[PDB]
Design a protein around this nucleic acid. Structure first.
Ligand SMILES: [Mg+2]
Lengths: 82, 107, 69, 101, 106, 97
RNA sequence: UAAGUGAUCUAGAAAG
RNA sequence: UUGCCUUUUACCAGAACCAUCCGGGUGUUGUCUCCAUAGAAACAGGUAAAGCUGUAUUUUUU
């Protein structure tokens, strides 16, 4: 099974960042993920390529359109790796 | 314990207890009074031993025989046990006579 | 394999952000494993309505932001 | 009876002897003892009885020792084997019981 | 093979008995640890005016719950309090058989 | 010692310290029937030897019923129910002297 | 209608 | 502190400290015995055998 997916799952709870193919970055508490990176977040900001920020409550995001997901540095320490 | 396992350290024949188990158990019924008494006594003996633990020497490796071996005056053979026993009897006898004679009492 | 857990978003109004910087609105009725949304129709982002009930395809979805908390 | 707690009892007032003169210190304090006394009287009237508790028991004997258990129960004063539930796939006879504490 | 067999024939139990000068009738007996200082002096505690005698409080029970049933226990070790051993061994040279017990309902 | 009864210690004693439980003990225990032979005799010898409140309770019950009825069927206002209740009470009083 | 189960110390040799 | 006892040793049996002993491991050396003897191989990849992974139509690569 996908180790990045696993990592993402683990990160559940944390304040993750999230950019799409469109280039619109989000940053907030990760709620839920799946095998395909079907992310959900809570209490999340949303900045476009221009730079104008927009706050929002509950966002769901589809893994296909997701570019990359930034997790906090805490999960580097442990423990799903080895 | 004894058979549960299939590997072990060797105990001395001395250090095995085949009677112990019976007396530890509740006695088999319809036995005479004397037997019961004996059992009780055995239990008591066991219990006292258990209670007061005589923890052994930390220091002393040097057993008696080892020291003797370390000298030149002892040498060692392999002997039939009966022969050894006989020797002991004779040697022992000699010792007791010799000491007695030294004491002066030859009578 | 796993179903999208959108039971919290059932019967709620959702801003579906879709391909080409477009948007859809409406109350959520149903869904499946491919993320094909079934929702009661609303306006496309001044603003104008089309359709009664709508069924959106999974691939087209960029996001779906919950209007109702 | 025992200066020990009351259980499974109703207390409906029938009449209250309250005087014309009213003072908050006496009226309440007096009631405090008096109520208890009244309750006691009521209890006395109503054919009082001590209630001991009963432990609900579970024993889990083997099959063939049930008679022994029964005998034991008989020997104790209050005792009741309500049901001897058969613990499947095992020798045990999970016997529900009642024994006064 | 049943460990529960040794109830009130444990070393611990024996020790307790010794402490409490209380023979489990089958087992051994010793000189008491403490001399029985019979100096109650007819006090209001443990009187026969006060207590009830539904149970006879056998000395079997003393070494089982030493700290409870016995009053002023001294140098008393704690005993065990066990599970039951359903262990069936076949003596007729047969293999995996529900012999001594009974089948499930369904 | 077994049930508080055995001789404290085997030493000193100058005896086995053996303890047969007595069969007089049983006899001593058992004479509940013997007590009846005496107890029974004793028993034989000494063998031969409010309404207003109720009414009030009934009235109270009636009142309660009335209140319930009022609650059920058109009596959001207090005056009506109270009035009716009062009337009922009066009637009850009349009935009981 | 119900009695009667069990608790069992010891234990010799010298010199005086 | 008890008990047999009346003197002690030799003893009774419990307690508290203590020791002695009969033994036990573990580790490190050193020896004693019985069997034995090579000072250099991986890289380009094959030949053969052992360890694990695999079996284009919406979220990865058609
Ligand atoms: Mg002299």
């Amino acid at each position: 099974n996908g180790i990045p997916v696993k990592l993402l799952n683990e990160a559940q709870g944390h304040i993750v960042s999230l950019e799409l193919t469109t280039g619109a970055t989000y940053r907030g508490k990760l709620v839920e993920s799946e095998d395909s990176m079907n992310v959900q977040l809570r209490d999340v900001i949303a900045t476009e390529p221009q730079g104008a920020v927009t706050h929002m409550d509950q966002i769901f995001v589809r893994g296909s359109q997701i570019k990359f997901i930034v997790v906090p540095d805490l999960l580097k320490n442990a423990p799903l790796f080895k | 314990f004894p058979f549960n396992r299939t590997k072990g350290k060797m105990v001395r024949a001395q250090d095995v207890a085949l009677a112990k188990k019976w007396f530890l158990q509740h006695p088999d019924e319809e036995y005479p009074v004397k037997v019961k008494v004996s059992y009780q006594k055995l239990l008591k003996n066991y219990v006292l031993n258990e209670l007061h633990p005589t923890l052994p020497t930390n220091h002393n490796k040097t057993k008696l025989l080892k020291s003797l071996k370390n000298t030149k005056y002892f040498q060692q053979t392999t002997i039939d046990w009966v022969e050894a026993g006989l020797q002991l009897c004779r040697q022992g006898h000699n010792m007791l006579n010799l000491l007695i004679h030294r004491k002066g009492l030859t009578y | 394999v796993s179903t999208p857990e959108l039971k919290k978003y059932m019967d709620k109004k959702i801003l579906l952000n879709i391909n080409g910087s477009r948007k859809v609105a409406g109350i959520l009725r149903g869904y499946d494993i491919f993320l094909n949304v079934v929702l009661d129709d609303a306006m496309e982002i001044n603003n104008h309505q089309l359709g009664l009930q709508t069924v959106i395809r999974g691939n087209s979805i960029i996001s779906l932001e919950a209007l109702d908390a | 009876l025992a200066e020990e707690p009351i259980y499974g009892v109703q207390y409906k007032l029938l009449s209250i002897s309250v005087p014309s003169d009213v003072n908050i210190d006496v009226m309440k304090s007096q009631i405090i003892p008096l109520m208890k006394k009244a309750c006691y009287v009521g209890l006395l009237t109503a054919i009082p009885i001590l209630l001991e508790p009963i432990y609900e028991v579970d024993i889990t004997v083997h099959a063939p020792l049930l008679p022994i258990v029964e005998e034991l129960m008989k020997k104790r004063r209050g005792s009741r084997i309500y049901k001897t539930i058969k613990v499947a796939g095992t020798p045990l006879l999970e016997v529900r019981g009642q024994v006064p504490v | 093979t049943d460990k529960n067999y040794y109830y009130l024939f444990d070393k611990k139990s024996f020790f307790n008995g010794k402490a409490l000068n209380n023979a489990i009738p089958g087992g051994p007996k010793f000189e008491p640890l403490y001399p029985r200082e019979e100096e109650e002096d007819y006090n209001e505690f443990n009187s026969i005016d006060r207590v009830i005698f539904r149970v006879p409080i056998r000395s079997e029970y003393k070494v089982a719950f030493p700290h409870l049933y016995n009053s002023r226990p001294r140098s008393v070790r704690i005993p065990w309090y066990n599970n039951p051993v359903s262990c069936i061994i076949q003596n007729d040279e047969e293999y995996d058989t529900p012999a001594l017990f009974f089948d499930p309902s369904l | 010692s077994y049930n508080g009864i055995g001789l404290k210690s085997a030493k000193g004693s100058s005896t086995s310290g053996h303890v047969q439980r007595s069969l007089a003990s049983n006899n001593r225990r058992r004479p509940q029937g013997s007590q009846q032979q005496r107890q029974q005799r004793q028993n034989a010898i000494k063998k031969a030897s409010i309404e207003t409140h109720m009414e009030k309770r009934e009235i109270e019950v009636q009142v309660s019923e009335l209140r319930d009825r009022l609650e059920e069927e058109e009596t959001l206002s207090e005056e009506q129910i109270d009035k009716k209740c009062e009337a009922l009470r009066a009637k009850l009083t009349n009935e009981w002297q």
